[model samples]
Target: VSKGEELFTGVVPILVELDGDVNGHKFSVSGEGEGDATYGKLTLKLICTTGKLPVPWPTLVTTLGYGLQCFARYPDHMKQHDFFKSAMPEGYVQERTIFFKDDGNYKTRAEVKFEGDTLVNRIELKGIDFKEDGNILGHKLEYNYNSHNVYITADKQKNGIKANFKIRHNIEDGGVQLADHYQQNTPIGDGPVLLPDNHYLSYQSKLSKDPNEKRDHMVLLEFVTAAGITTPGWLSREQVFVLISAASVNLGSMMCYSILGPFFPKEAEKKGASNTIIGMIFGCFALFELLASLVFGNYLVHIGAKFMFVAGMFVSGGVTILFGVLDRVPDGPVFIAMCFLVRVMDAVSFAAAMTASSSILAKAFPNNVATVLGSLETFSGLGLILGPPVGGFLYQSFGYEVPFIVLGCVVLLMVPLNMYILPNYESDPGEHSFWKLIALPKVGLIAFVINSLSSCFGFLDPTLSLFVLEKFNLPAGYVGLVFLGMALSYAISSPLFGLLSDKRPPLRKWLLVFGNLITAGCYMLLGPVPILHIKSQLWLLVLILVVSGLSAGMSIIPTFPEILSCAHENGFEEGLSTLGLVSGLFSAMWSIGAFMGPTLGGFLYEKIGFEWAAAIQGLWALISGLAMGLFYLLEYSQVQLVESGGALVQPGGSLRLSCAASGFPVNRYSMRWYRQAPGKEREWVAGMSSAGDRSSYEDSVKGRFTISRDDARNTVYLQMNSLKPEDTAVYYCNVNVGFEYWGQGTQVTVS
Candidate 1:
């Protein structure tokens, strides 16, 4: 058994043996190695077997259950959980045991037990310092186990160690199986648990009572200080701040989406007086988001990303709190209005956050813009996956209001975090007049119109709960499950599209076009699916939604960077301002769509049913996609061409050239040739030349000889009066070439 050798039962599982630098595998293992009776302290190498091991004994299973418990108990905790602690229990355990060696050092191990029917476990490490030099950063534990499964957690405050474990399920005999804890629950084989042969948990003590009863499951992890070991990378504070900022933003975005709709459905339902109305309510919010984006986008040009982002976060957080407080009353119309307002707030927040973050990211690493943006989108997708399930459980257990309040508070905290942690941001230096700020070029304006048109019909209700209630007449509580379905779709597709973005930067534009077309086609099909008695195939609609989001992710994620690059090529120089304006335009576009979505969609739904509304939406997507595609292509080509010319061309040529060269202007340039030939060497070159003239050439080209070419006389003469040979130069006979400027006279002599 060597490191890197695959332990093959079917799929290859990673395994590495401890080297003989630590106390030579002195960790303990207990139990019958099967069933619920397994318990004891066995040597490290004797009983330990590694493969793609399943639950009970394998590392992934324990951590997964632990994670699920945390999700079930406190949905908001998902965001709070440190990045280092995301993997399941087995992964965490493996991470912890990485330092264990065969020398005179410490090794960490878990003492898991099948207490009656439930799996109770404790983690312990020995032979490590509790107090080194004055810092009590390390600790050793005596034999201890919790009565219930503990929820594992790790955070910066805890030095990245965290797990919450409490008894929620049983560990049956030979019930070891891998768990797909990811929100989508990507298929693994058969049941929730796989094979029944190797299931085991390490049970240490038979007595349930201990002297320190409160500390049954909680124990300190110990680490022995190596003579000279340092943290890797030694990343600067700035880099670490970026990492944290990224994590927080990604996590918070997910939680907001997951919790917002479910918390407000009751009031929305009452206002609309129908399930469809509620769905319309959700659609309206998305519309608002789209519209608000445009406003924020333009505003970013002047205000700067830092202030806008901070303000957006504050607004979002405030809205969240307001929603929580408003939940207690039944103001139907007010509630619906507030929902729309909240969506707008979210729109602003998203626009500011995204533009600022992406702009900063673009400036920071100009070379890898595509990859970095893609990666950010990928993390956001992960947040989407994690957010819903946790939200669902929290709403289920503690009711809706708590989640909103907690989320609001957390979001509010992010405002300060961003201000302090992020670098001081400044807008690019360029003259940004009010008129110029509002007045985008013709192409950009077209793009904005297209965005609005598409959003008018393309935005479906993001409120999955409301949609489920309207479409299937489901209970309010069941909305979480429906949202869960949609979120799962996003989780799966977002990362997929993000991955594709990295692979095919050139294909992004076309893919977005195709994606929009597909979405439109699906919307059109949805109208008939219900009328034709194929409503059961509605899940197909969800599939389409996933595809739509994927396309959108592909299209929108690369847009700001492309736009900035365009501005640079055209000599605009204000990349951030342009990005903001662009973002704001999109926001406004979506807002118009949102305003229409519910009013028009609801009207259409009432008269002709969901089918017609869907059809209209599809048509909108097609048109919007076409418009976006056209602009993307035109800008991409023009920018690339202009940039390729180096510094030879004037600033703002492509658009300005089109303006000057259009219609009658084309003929005006044909007869306008004017020239003023050089008169004085001192006057002409003084202002234009950036460098000094060559002094060495002065001795050669200065006045030293006169030449005459008298063709009428049939003779030629050269009179050289200069003393130095270097002063003499050659002359040529000219018969009125083409231009006025010419090298007129020359001389020849020896120094």
Candidate 2:
């Protein structure tokens, strides 16, 4: 041992030796270290010799000093150290252990400690243990910590193994320098060594402001291993399916808008088709989807959603490939007709996948429908945004065929993934009928919202390029860029709003209203709104498109959640079967909107102007927003149950229950009554309202019930003539604000 100045003034050398049976194999390890005390620089080397073994040996070597960390492999003796350094505050103490093992059983342990300004360095070998099968025997190993180096020795030989191990460090005045001395000198025996030549070391070091400080600076070094890090284990099968579906949808969209959008129209024009004919060709795709959905929506529950998803991907991929083949054909009526038929086929297949995929997510995350579905949509948006640019680049560089062929191949790849990975869920046999689901309160409103919003998107899809061309005289190649900002913003905002809607139920409704309002304003700006007088500036248009995309993202993310929540609250059974029907209907409604958008938008663009066509969508959005607000207000008011006679009623006595609406007009509203028994589902009792010409009373209950209307007071009166002890259950007066949007229930007891 050296003290103070002498510790830093001299060179030091150290040796180490070890002998043991590691993982049932006889082995010997030797190490050497050389250090220059004047510079605090050191170099260390290790060697291991082993007999032929049945299994590979596993080992790790580590070094922790001041604010420096390093790690290297042992046994295989390939010297490669991963080093990381950090600044240390004054009076810091660093301590760490380097442990070696074979098959999880300990083989050697080295504990190193460095203390404050005292420049005291300590190292302990802690002995080696030899193990054969279940038997364990200790081997003597000694270690001495000098001011400049650490010395370790294993003099005793275990069994027939004779070994010597040594370690030495060379230190210089300017701190330790990284050197490969260990790499060139460490000797590894050829006998079946278990450890690989390239192994990883974990090195960790810490620095503190003071020796006693609890909080300190820390640095961790990781070795580049053969196996890379993996994703979190918490990701479930459902999330995986959702992500796959999202990627598939985006890839498909990218192929369509980027590759086909530009080429198809030009190809059609070569065959004597005008802009209207081109628009029709695109619009027909949505029409086919809408029509097919109507025909298949009721039956999707009977067929597995996963099957539909896989089958759809197959058909879509096939059609996409076919389109590429057909593109190379001569430009004529035959080519045009083939293109039309292929797109129609693609549309049908796409609808099948879309509806089934949405249903799959809705069923998997019933309670948090918004977040899950929103996450899916975020991927969709990302695909839509990214697809065009990538597609455009591919198309421009390699021609249209490449984008189509590549993307079609990608879609084909998803088929196996979907079939193998997507969870196969069984539909419930006791699902509610389609009529009943549609008749549920607010279903109609939700459907209308879907239709209207989707229509707005569709309306712009076909004509947007034309508008850009006509206004700015831009080329076909540049047209896809106009949508980039919009798609990107929508994609970014979708998951965020979806998460928000999941956490706050009320936020969905409000977001829908505000999102629509914002969208409506943006549309007006894009249109012939006299107040704004927006010109045809590309930057201005792009800005408005981005804002509109964000609003659309916010609005669309809540739509599914709202529909599912309405179904959930209104007593629809929670399962894939119920969700399938709802999601199918939602898709169908959206398809209808999409079907109408381009067809009407094209005709209107030709007959009127782009400005008027755009304004129409804005008008629709504004009306929808206002209607949603009104519905919210009506549902927000508490239902007041006014007793016509008294709270207490004897058996065989008559009682009148009046339910009045507060904030909205009640003349056109429908009032429903339900009774819940102790441990049973709520039974629908009666409905009172003049919804049509024949309404005086509509009673579904099996009890003595009469319904009367009070038009002047905006109330519905229910008369129970022969109240009995059996009618002691809770009675609820649910108003049709939207899906069982009920007022406060009045519990009447018959004594």
Candidate 3:
């Protein structure tokens, strides 16, 4: 009979012939298989087997348990009695054996056994003496199906070859397959070879033992290697958390505002409250957040980000639940008061969460600050863009309470995320004060920039729906779409600007200047500027808002990085440390802006016309852009210096030095003096401010150096009395704005 052809119980059975190649040797076996029709054992008897080697190959004799099928072609009645089933029964065993001959004419036996689902095979070659080219003899091969371990042992003296190996299939940890004692080898030719199915196991044994290797490492390695690209490791766990939290916060905030802001005015109207009162209610949340940050931001680092985040999430979630409950109350002052109190509570929690999250990002990814923060901003913008439409749909379908309750529950989910996943970093004890940060001109300017921009964005929150309602006669449901376009543009542009800023630091300043200028133009276009008259043009208004949002993206993305860079640079110069205060200060400024924006916007929209209100905002942006330009130019300008003391001065003779700069008030700048002794590095001798205060380092040069400044001339002077040979060095004058500046040095020689 040919291969694959079978016989029945009553027919003459055919011999089963098998041929294969193993380890470069050809082997053949022939056997006759027979079985009872129903419940007895089936056996295959091997009549002859041959191999290319002189040693006889194994006689393949096999026996199966009762009800095992012996032939492929069986009667329908007999097939039903076959042993194979969906699952094997416990304690069931099946065994088979084969025999082989050696040059010593001794017989070796191999046994195969099956217990339930596990298959075990062992080769016994103890009595038979086997010899090969290397004096190696194979002893046994044993396998355990449960542990997926294969053990092989051989005697070097008996078989003239050394072989001992343990192979394991580990699919539990990272699905790694490994051979504990095998080296990888590739066959040279296409001839049939017994290739081991354990390549992954070969290299896996030397890999890192740490069980929780970051998933991104393997993903990035595979991605770049497959794409033939090489790059640095830029992803981190902290960045992932920041991105997720940013998206969550923005989505929840925007969705809440979209549904809540529109309903708030109507809710107040039902309670007999005026539009102004409603605006105040809306602004109260930001006011509380601002105040909370001012009061508690400094202590956030000490409190621990993880704890603050979880606590804040719980509180915010509770406040949201309270909002849902408030909807059931009657329309009266009590309801209004409850609304105000709930929002105020939410703002406090929000402040803590924002502060902690920002600090965590700053501390975690200091070097990639711009990229990571920008990514967070990008996700936030996306959330804002999508939130309004989604909230609108939910509100329209399920009413107000459902959205609030659902979003509140969503915020509560973050508690578990923070508790388990967020990394706990040690508190940084930095020696810098928030007041000192405000004292710096550039830092103050940036803070003001944040406040102004945030205010401009927030100003639209309360007034936008009303503005569209009166001017365009649009429904509340569609108003969100208008803002959606703007947010979408902002979201798309944020990452682009962020990456650009990281690649080129100088571009940050330029982008801020140009972004504000562009936004100013867009605002003017949006408002009733004398240049063009387009009345109630909704499409034109949306287009202009989109343009404004893209410009705002350019401004907002760089602002945080600029603040961080400014803080880092100035902190280095002033010998101060810590980014916590700076980061907190930034949050505080944004909250301040948010508070003022809607309050002022609502008041202005009510008192003045929309045209005048928008125009005024445009004017503010224009002024801010111009002021940033002025500061930028002043930062790089040259300052003139002169030394009056003689180059050859006698010991104990006093020396004088003076410095002057244009376009700057003397009171705003600090003057420092440095002495470079003959063979020593430049050392700070004494410093004097225009306010007439000396630094604590003055004790080092007390009685030897005195500093004075002239505000009218924008100049400062330093005098050294009782000069000695040790003081005979190059004396340099430095002008201090936010960053340090140096003038030409004068060599003061003492003889």
Strongest candidate by lDDT: 2
Question: Model 2 over residues 476-504: C-alpha lDDT tens digits?
Answer: 76776777777788777878888888887
TM values, all candidates: 0.44, 0.51, 0.51
Candidate 3 global Cα RMSD = 28.5
Full candidate order by TM-score, most accurate first: 3, 2, 1
The lDDT-based order of candidates, best leading, equals: 2, 3, 1
In every candidate, how many clashes are there? 59, 33, 9
* Candidate 1 structure quality by residue, lDDT tens digits, 290-338: 6456545555546766676556567667766756655456675565555
Candidate 3 C-alpha lDDT tens digits along 1-751: 2111221222223234444333334445444444332212233443325533232211111111111222222223233322221122221222211222222212222233334323232322222333554111231111111111212222223221112233222111111122222211222223232222111101111111123632211000000000111334666555576666655654565455455544555455555656676556656866667778876666765676667776766777776666674445566657545556746776776677677667666665655777777777777776665554454465576665677666767766755665655666554445566678678888777766777788788876556777776657888778777887877887778788888788877667877888888878888877675557566577787888888889888888777777767766674321112455656677788888867666667668778888889888778877877788778866764345554444788888777776666645676445566667777755556665444654423455777666677777766677767777766688777653422356677777777
Report clash pairs, candidate 3. Answer: 134-160, 135-159, 135-160, 135-161, 136-159, 136-160, 136-161, 137-159, 178-201
Better of 1 and 3 by TM-score: 3
